[PDB]
Amino acid sequence: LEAEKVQAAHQWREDFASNEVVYYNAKDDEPGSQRIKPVFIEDANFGRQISYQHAAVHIPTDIYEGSTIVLNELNWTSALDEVFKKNREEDPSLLWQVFGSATGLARYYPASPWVKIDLYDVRRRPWYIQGAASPKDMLILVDVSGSVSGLTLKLIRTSVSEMLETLSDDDFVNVASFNSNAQDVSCFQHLVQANVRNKKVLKDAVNNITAKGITDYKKGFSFAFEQLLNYNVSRANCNKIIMLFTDGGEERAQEIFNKYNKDKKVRVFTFSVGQHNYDRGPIQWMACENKGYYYEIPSIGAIRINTQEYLDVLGRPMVLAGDKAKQVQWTNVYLDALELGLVITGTLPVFNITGQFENKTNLKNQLILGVMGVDVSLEDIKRLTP
């Protein structure tokens, strides 16, 4: 509630020369912001040194601090420290409280130094992913024709693995490959629970694909649409998406889309992978005509960002639902990133409601600002069962 209210009253200033931003950047030993030096007293209930005076901020390595977006985000999130302190005072036995931004940064309390190179990204975390959208029925079409041989095949494999890394036990996934003939890349033949074992099997299967043949989009899309109408097996009965991985084609396949999803009940996200000179027009048309989105992955450095942005599109019906789409969910048991043991995380999404007082913007207010998170250690639960 406080995050929504504070962000609603924001100005989006374009310069930060004299209006410095004061915050404690984690993992430290630029013009536009100031830095905080904390005291870092040793405290129990944490295995590290913490400071209750303010909140720490983590910004991923490949995201530049001091840009306009990150500086505006820091300025409007500087008002969360008061509620962090109030929550800590109302219940001393409280662990990490975190705001994960769609910008990329995470502001967490109490302030602690961050834990080689750091590859942590807030938007890839299980709690952020479960709070950013609803369960899904992902189906991945991989183009394995002759034209994808080379580096645009290893990029496709890496991208498919990274996108499988974004699924959980509530999501159901399958992978199919087509070259003038569509077939499953593994032994599954239908959507599976997408747990650790099934994801490992799918990753091993997709690492073994070789490229040869001629692309036929109609057959692959017919296979994909038929795989989503099984209903003989356990599914999620929620978001149904087809995630196509190609380089570039010439066929739009209007007949398949018209026949199967006539009412556009299934989204189609499309990815153009590699450095090539094929036509991207049909790919973007297929993305636009089926509530989907078009992405470009030309290198390894673009794989991580582009394989997680599809959760922005899936979050539109959740923000449009209103306050009914605000339910505290709890993750599976996982090891805390800041070395705290086994924890579960409570999750609540945060909506952008600037201009919703008069209800006039409705343009970028259909995306989430970020995710609330609070950690509960399994020792806390064990203390309640003598």
Binding site: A133, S134, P135, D170, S234, A236, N237, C238, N239, K240, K265, R280, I283, Q284, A287, C288, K291, G292, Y293, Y294, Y295, E296, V313, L314, R316, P317, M318, L320, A321, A325, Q327, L363, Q366
Partner: peptide
């Protein structure tokens, strides 16, 4: 047992922007 809360195919969804029109 899966969750009983599903949010999809909202009527008021914009969906008028893809990644190709901007780029």
């Amino acid at each position: 047992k899966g969750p009983d809360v599903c949010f999809d195919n909202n009527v008021l969804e914009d969906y008028t922007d893809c990644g190709g029109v901007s780029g």
